[model samples]
Target chain A: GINYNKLIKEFGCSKITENHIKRIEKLTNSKAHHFIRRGIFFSHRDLDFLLNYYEQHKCFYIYTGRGPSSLSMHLGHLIPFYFCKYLQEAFNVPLVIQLSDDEKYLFNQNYSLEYINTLTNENVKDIISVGLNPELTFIFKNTEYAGYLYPTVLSIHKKTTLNQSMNVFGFNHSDNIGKISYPSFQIAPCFSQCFPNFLGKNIPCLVPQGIDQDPYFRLSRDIAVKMALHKPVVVHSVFMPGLQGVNSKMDHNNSVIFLTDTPEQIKNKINKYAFSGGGTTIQEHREKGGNLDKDISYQYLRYLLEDDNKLNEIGEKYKKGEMLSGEIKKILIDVLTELVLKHQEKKKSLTDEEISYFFDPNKPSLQKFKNM
Target chain B: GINYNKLIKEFGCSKITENHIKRIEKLTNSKAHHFIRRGIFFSHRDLDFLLNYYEQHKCFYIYTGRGPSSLSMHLGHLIPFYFCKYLQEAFNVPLVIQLSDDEKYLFNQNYSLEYINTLTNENVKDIISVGLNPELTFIFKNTEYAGYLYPTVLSIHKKTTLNQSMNVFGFNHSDNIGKISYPSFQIAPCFSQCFPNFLGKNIPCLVPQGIDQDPYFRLSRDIAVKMALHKPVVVHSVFMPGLQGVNHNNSVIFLTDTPEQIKNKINKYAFSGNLDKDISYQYLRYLLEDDNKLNEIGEKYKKGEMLSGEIKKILIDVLTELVLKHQEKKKSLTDEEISYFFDPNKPSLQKFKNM
Candidate 1:
């Protein structure tokens, strides 16, 4: 199983408390999303302050990014966007999604700007499938937006020392200068007030990402507080266990269920690679039931699916050994299948004109910022 | 008193040989520039290759830059351009000048982008007055040209590691990431063949920078040679000793200095003591730009026949007049003309004129 207890300490993030969950539910007069309800969005820093501030009629923006490493994003990549989409709906705030094509080129010498750029266009479609409103959301690739980012980028770099990067990330001697200097651009958008757009107001920022990304935020958070800007609030989720489980953290090729996977591919991967906490045999499983601790199929449904009754009934039936291991796998396969097709169907309607609706802030048709 | 011998040995560069200078003078069929004869350009790497290569093929480009750390370039700052002007006059090679405004901003937290941009425009004007052919010279400020420089910058960075930067410059962790990552953009113009509109072919580059900047080339040279490109030839010039001589390294003379300002800085700052009169005598020779006048001044100063005020006045008059002439040349140029040099789209170097 993915160790939350070890990670919460190692990542140096505040544990998401029950009081936060209670306050969010009460303040919004609604139920918490499945990800938070099931302990998937598991840790945070200053999240209570973010919620209480929002409750006191305060407004904040959100900033998150992806490295665009592959043409086809696996299921793991969508976890951040899924929750970001929820935040956008709940708060009705402007969001900025950074497509980190520059980082991809710097870390690997093999890829060219053109190659990474092609990946960005395709990967962006998958994110749009998560249904973030095109009006309030802006998606940008670094190379195209370098002009808009330079002042803030240089501003961030001036304040940050190489010593801070070494202390925070521990980039060794072998790392190239590009990677060493990359955090300036990575953290630049956190202070949107420095840019002409985004209201040019020193508004607060909220970042929701995986726990592995907490160090960068913590590093920038300290500096941001010292600068003329507000410290960005970060809420971290636990890593969505790859199909092959926690052991597959480093090498998850066979385990990755890419969004492009066909139904058969999804089924084969689950059966062949998905780590199960259930018994080895059907007869044994009927008496002992499944462990449910390291069971990925159970966790996937618990995190992504919205049906409260369906999830609880499955939990009870599985614990009582009435639900076979194949039956649970069948449930997860069906859930992922519907999600994938719906995503592709949603993505098809996103045209280049529509993409520009988010990108071309100069355009008058969809004045996203005016609404904000 | 900056030791060239120790620098040559430590930087792992070759000394500029008499044979190379003799050949250059013979090839150009003119007397060596006074700076060369006086050993102002003292050290080199593969300079023999540069001469032999030019003799053999006659096609190459030049690369040099300044950080725009100050608005008024000093005599030291002008040394690269003096040698550069010589190369362009003799060979007419295409030149690329980089005004590293981004690095200046990165290194100093006190200056805004507007401040650095202001410095760059004035810096480019001083460089243009140094007699580089505007048509053949393509000058760029990093802030505006970073996009065009992006591909080559990444190409260079992919090859250069932090280990090399630390070894060459010994930048401590207190340094900002901009300064850490900066050598990439600083060194990229050396490989302009990879970038658009600079030179999309692997032509050799001869960089006439000061010895202080030689380590960056050594860092890039190892990689460039491995990549099957010609290693850039670097010719090192001595630092123009500051007005307070070597100790007052920061209080340098401005090229924009008037005769009154020039006299003040020269007398107040130029060191005189147990100090050898080599630097003072050399400045007189450099400012006068005449050999017979230098010999006459040298003889009088050594014989204790010339007053210190007389020597300072001579340098002050010559330097102030030179600064005045530069301002006049720059005064004739339009702001559009100055900005024309920074735009890559305005490149007028259609063919290598020397080639």
Candidate 2:
């Protein structure tokens, strides 16, 4: 039910075009990522400008983050980080991953700071397992590094008005003062000043994030104009619709696939809970085939399945009565189980030192193309 | 005219009665501070409770701050710090002075952080010259120690609503978000937990501040109730009237004023033609230590036995002595001595924290 075209216009961001994808492929000397090819990352603020800057300077850092609201990230949360890994690979540039522990505490009244901090540690491991480069990535939680980032935070806070916060985030006067002030923390990472030691001042930053988070970045861009800093070049991906359907977002276990779900659980949840657009009866399904447009299994495959030909073949077979809803669910279950198991293995392989390297703000992250 | 009774009643604070002054004199086994005896510190939130707690625990910390808007503090600025020195000398308790460089920056768009920081350095010297014990005082700017105090700041911020901030500080939707959130920073130090290693957790805090700053501590007290923390006991001082008179404001005498400037300001701007409304008498009432001398001068002026020029000369002599003594002491203070006051890592002065 979400309107991608209307959001592109309404949010004042451009749709990522085929030309943009080809240009990215040509620039990086590699094929465009599947997310870009399939239009999963469907909109942008200034990808053209970012690529132009990269062409000139051979550099631009990436910034993205998580709220750490839960101990384990649902599959829906991985969409941005997965693409961030791809962008990091293609650009070979540094990345800053912010874990918003303060934001989670401020927004959730029932959640204690200790509970949110515990979630922060668990969630960072999951983010690390996304195959990001440990040497080049900087992962920081807000509460730990707020002092370092405070100058930039105050710069943004000084320019942001109460009305602007309310308008951008739908904040009401009844909201806690911390909630009202927290958007500045979210906006601070967009500036290169926040990472002055790692990246020199005023370097461009590319933020790959979910479309729902677009408003925060848009506010950032507006404040950037006021501060005369580079506006963060943003690329937005559509939400990975829930297993139940497009209307569901997180919180209900039935509607989301947790990264820690067991193989049997993944198999059962997909088979039982995933909404289907197949016919009412088996005979009718064989004759009429599945409605791939409305099917959750096919949607999940577009994000998860890396092979273009096999994915297209699965779609064709399901629509032509050669494949059933059960068959597609089985395919999704296998693909997800392999990815989740691989993710689990990768997450377990990360040592405390490896994780510490990313979280330590003092770690040296010497950028390439530094006046060579 | 500012109504002291109306302020005490409306701010929900207790008036500092004669009994309170006498009790303080007896408890400390010293004469009441001139500010207290002369009713310059006209109101209080919980002085009785603080004294009772101090009697039992032999301790409570002091908190006060400055906004650091100007490069140098004026004579008006010295009132609370001078009184704070009296309290510190009386009880030998630790004192914490916050230099709110961040608040000045947030409130004054024209002032740069660097400029405010410059003012912070200068202002701390003036405060230090007030003769507070270097061994027992800790001075800090908000920007420098905001990191250390951020947990407490966030704790206060989480319970404070946007509406509550607006009501307390007159913040509107057009104000910057920094200004809106800044009250929490002001309120954070009122909690003893803000200096846990130095003061231990949840010790009593007494704040000596201008009455205008009452709303902030009132808000702090409200939030403390919600946090189940100790509400800071506050003692409030009446404003030191400007040389041009109480209603005609901002004709303030700076601490940096030379002997000549002090003489000229008192002679030219002292609203002294009327004894009841005389600015010179008000300054004497604040600074003149001898009650007999102050009363004699007042009676002489009231009975038409003294002229405006004569009283103005007396005020000039009193103010010159005060400023010269302060300037001499401030000149003798070294940068290293001043740095010791602002150092966050200074050793704990916990000898008084018997409880």
Candidate 3:
């Protein structure tokens, strides 16, 4: 349904192609992920270079980040986190997640510094609850790491031009010089191999992020090429649809599920606002059951559920008028409630000792991760 | 020898109105500086406010810097330091001489880091030979104090805009971003109130620099006002001439020059508005301190009784003695003695009547 070839036209990325999936399964000796099979994590920029590393028995870090946009981080936020968790477990490589308070300070107009700091704490708990291992993941915020971040950021600042920055970031006069200089902070961590005493200087980076964030990786690729070194590759995921459809600008919608939403709230939102594909009446329902093409209930299960055979069985039953949209919506509500409840329980136990381990660049993960 | 009022319009600064000089003579209750009496220090901005500071018994630090652009420090460069010494003794204030190795690296393409640092070390010794007190002066280079400078500089970086930077510095897109960000390093030294553990955070700054460096203080004054604090006022000096006069552009008459080296720069050159009887007149008026003897040189030059060669001989004898005395003082300085000035722990401001 995503029209993979047209995506290659509109967005200038090479398709994953049939050979990539075959090579992936053969090389890792594992099955393809649901998102990869369903054309969700569909686009790439030099992703084959990451394959070249595995062929040579090398390790590369996966890069992802969160900006903590609001008090309750919506389900849209975790799409990258869930994929990063999969990439981490599949390859057993180290992870870097930049939990950016600077990003919030620049974009959000009316928020306080205290408010953003509080939101970052809550948002990091949600990310850690996605089961990212603290031993290998380095999660950091800006103000906490200014002394460590300044030198590399300044080096990146020297090489970057104002024309390059203003053109890439769509700058305006009212945007302070800080915003113009902000891209380097994001780009520097990609080159931050020698950040810890344990990691070497030349490890390749692989960025896993939503397609909207491709401009950053694009800038990093150009920097790496100009500096004439090995660089990071990218595998992009699409934006998850807001419940109002593809064109919604509002971050909040009743049909949108947040990690903190109760089961009753989830169920109520799904039945009332979900864009269903079912027939209007029982007589019409029996004749033409459901399209399943744009149905929110089916799309949620198609991406989130792990079992391919189970998803395939449900698809046929709904098409043949044997199963209804109500039953599919029920399954969606039940699965999400159990997932988020386990997240809430795990989030309650994380203390500063558990948190600071990930923030410390000199943490012991370097030696442990080196053998991989 | 420098025109004062045309510089006022070109530099967009107010002329030091004559009444201000009379006011300075009264307010300090001391004889005016020779530079002030001769109208050599001619332009100003908010200089009266600094006098108000002294009238109220408040203190101000003197700000000036020498960018180490070349190996041999020039005689033209010592103009600010001589006046800085006069002010330091006259008012008994602290002075900061920023030795900029970073400025050399960012602007010059072919030099290495070690080369610029070596220039800075040599330049400071030449500065000390001018007789500034070690107790009341703080000298720093960029690379040595980057750890201390980074916080205030980054705050300044946050407040400065690209539009404002380009307008003030005449920078363009083809210029590297390093130059675009370079203004913050110059702006931060004017605010070293809380530097080291000894300095307080609220003292006013008085920037005593050549007219060429006034652009830096001009922008820094706007910043301190925007931050709702007292801005540093400037006392601008006219640029010193090369041994060649107003018509020449070779400004590097080096301080380490021998009397023979000095002869080469002056003989083939040294032209002023009047080439005949009075290049000696201007140099004599500038060099002479005794008022009665200046009248004697003035009378002889006006009647065409003083030959050009006779005046040139007198000027050379005076300069050789001045430079030879400087070389003797500099040779007596041990490297360890100079290292004590740079030591962070000792601070070396221990013995002085003024400090």
Candidate 4:
């Protein structure tokens, strides 16, 4: 009786309307960044309300996180970070990125503390590769920082109940207590990130994440309201479908294109594994061009390419059959290969000492926004 | 059906056996102190096992606590304190006294944070009045120390699930989360107090408390075993009856007894409120008899002359007939009174502070 297909379709159809966008623009008194203007961040709730506070010249910080389950992040993982980077640049606000190493341990049966630590370091390297201002960013791992901010974490835990958490996440009694309390860790960073310098006061926060993460933000919003905090405004994006072209989001195990994948691997996977509605014959294909909106290659390009004019040009060519399927796949491969290579180079330059320095709480860089 | 009268009678009985006395003497590796020898610590479970461990030269510490619901402690409150003080003096082991201010706040609706704070200070004063060795005693309040030792508290919180906590405490979903999570706070002290200097290591602990406090200790012992620590050995004592002679062990309101308060409260409240046919007057007259075994004064003071100036005098004479009356001794207490009972410069206090 559970209509998963309908759910996926409904998830895709939901969007941040133009009126809502304009309201947000008015409240913030700032134009939409490339991601927001292009509808990459397509859905929202209470976003305009956040903007209303923003329009009054009020402060709000940004929050987003990743579970360090893998060493190398795929393109799907970078979507939110890419958008978040632009939002931070435009708004000139503080950014908090949580590395959920604890979450990885809870979810993965074979996960060791050592492996999670390595993955967390690697994930931080990839995040820094996006050219985010390190001075403006604060990163935390649950196991390491939970002790330092125990009071804050405990306060949140005290406010939230298991029944309420279970209602939000569909957790049962038999699940591990770690998993039951995992949401509190995630929720703490939302409040902690916004009010890093202000120890006692709760500040407003805005979270930019994929739609699957909305349930967590919803719970945070509920708790924030109870604590009399400015509930975090959430901007949600649709799932980045895999090369297999399933309507559902990409899975790291099967559908993800790792940043470590070679150009040949990208091409081979796209040509062979990509789902298509192309006709049997070239003549039939020419009569009807591919659906660019739903196609994996086109979706990848829309999220990956920064130049709006170039992406639009690619869209037109694909619609008119001027760009062949192979050509379109080749374009995506080139873009991805360059992006991944540049990130790999940047990641190579970062030492373990540098990583520790960035992660250290006492030596936090708070004056990065002084000039702005 | 619950046998209410039987339970009341059972609470009234001092069930101390010679075996219990032998266990207490052997466990601490010292002579049974007056309180234990005189059957003050009247009941126990698995106390012989702890004594056996002690005889093998293994280390174990004592734990006891007070719920600071009142400013002045009655004679019943001193029973556990007195036993713990003897154990500390005889064994030369560590002692931890918890002040359950948070428990009082949760259970008593009229209590506030300020009231709990005031009660904690008063309770500490009363505890010091028991003449515990400051070098071994470490007294702490829940709210003040919870801030410093929050991780231990939170770790316990993280380990316990709501369903398990609810099932243990008979709590429903409608119960406040504060109530649900309060058990972890109580359990933290039981572990931390025994191993104050050793943050990661689990140390063996022993608790001396009343029989009614068993439920909380049962939960603590279960958690201690799960955490790979020694389950706390409990030395249970029966409740001291109130003026009305009602055995309300669970309610401390009726458990404590002051000589003056007991005599006045009994004469005014107990005798006047009696429902029996002329039995109240007979009981009163019997208490006044010189040869009556049921008379508390006559039985406690066999060699002393009977004096009946007022009801308060009879109560004070009965209480102090054999030894010093706590109320009369309390009048001699000055600003230096607590220092005589509590050594603030004790090593255990410093060690606990460092921890």
Top of the candidates by lDDT: 2
Candidate 2 TM-score over all chains jointly: 0.90
Residue-wise C-alpha lDDT for candidate 1, range A51-98, written one tens digit per residue: 876787546678988888665788888888888888876676668888
Candidate 2: residue B217 Cα off by (Å): 3.1
Query: Candidate 4, which CAPRI tier?
Result: incorrect
- In terms of TM-score, the best-performing candidate is 2
lDDT of 4 by residue, A240-324 (tens): 7887764756733447778778777777777777655454566666778767766778878877787889989988877776667
lDDT of 4 by residue, B1-355 (tens): 2333354355442345787677766665767765455443556555666677666755556777778855456555676787787787776667877787766766665566676778777667667656777667766666545554444554555557666777778866544345666677677766744334422245456788766766656777777766566676777654544445433422222223544544555445542222222223223332233434335543333333432233334443554431243434444557665443334345544443432
Show where candidate 4 strays beyond 4 Å: A1-32, A55-58, A66-73, A97-132, A141-200, A212-219, A259-267, A276-287, A342-353, A357-372, B1-33, B44-59, B63-90, B95-164, B192-200, B246-355
CAPRI-style grade of the A/B interface in model 2:
medium
Each prediction's number of clashing residue pairs:
3, 0, 0, 2
Give residue A21's lDDT in candidate 4 (0 to 100). Answer: 65
- Decide which is better by DockQ, 2 or 3: 2
| Ten-residue stretch with the least lDDT total in model 1 chain A | A363-372
Model 2 over residues A1-372: C-alpha lDDT tens digits? 788899888878899998998899988999989999998988998888998988888888888888886656878788788888898888778889999988898888888788998899999999999888877788998887787778788878899889988887788888999999998898888887787566778888898878888876678888899989999998888877889886665536878889999999999899989999898788999999998878999989999999999999999999987888998999999999999999999998989988898875555554442331
Candidates, ranked, lDDT = 2, 1, 3, 4
Please write out the lDDT profile of model 3 over residues B1-355, one tens digit for every residue: 3565676788788777788888777876677777777766777888888888777864677878888857676656777788888787777667777877766766675666677778888888998888777767877776666556655665566667778787888877666455676787787777744364445565677887667767656788887766466787887777655555542334445668889866655555655334322455566555666777767766665666876666666676666777887888888888877775564443533222122
Candidate 2, residues B228-341, lDDT tens digits: the string is 998889888887767776763238788888999888888887786666599988888888999999999999999999988899999889989999999999999998898888
Best by DockQ: 2
**TM-score per candidate, chains pooled:** 0.79, 0.90, 0.77, 0.73
TM-score of chain B of 4: 0.69
Superposed by TM-score, candidate 4 places the C-alpha of residue B211 at a distance from the truth, in angstroms, of: 1.8
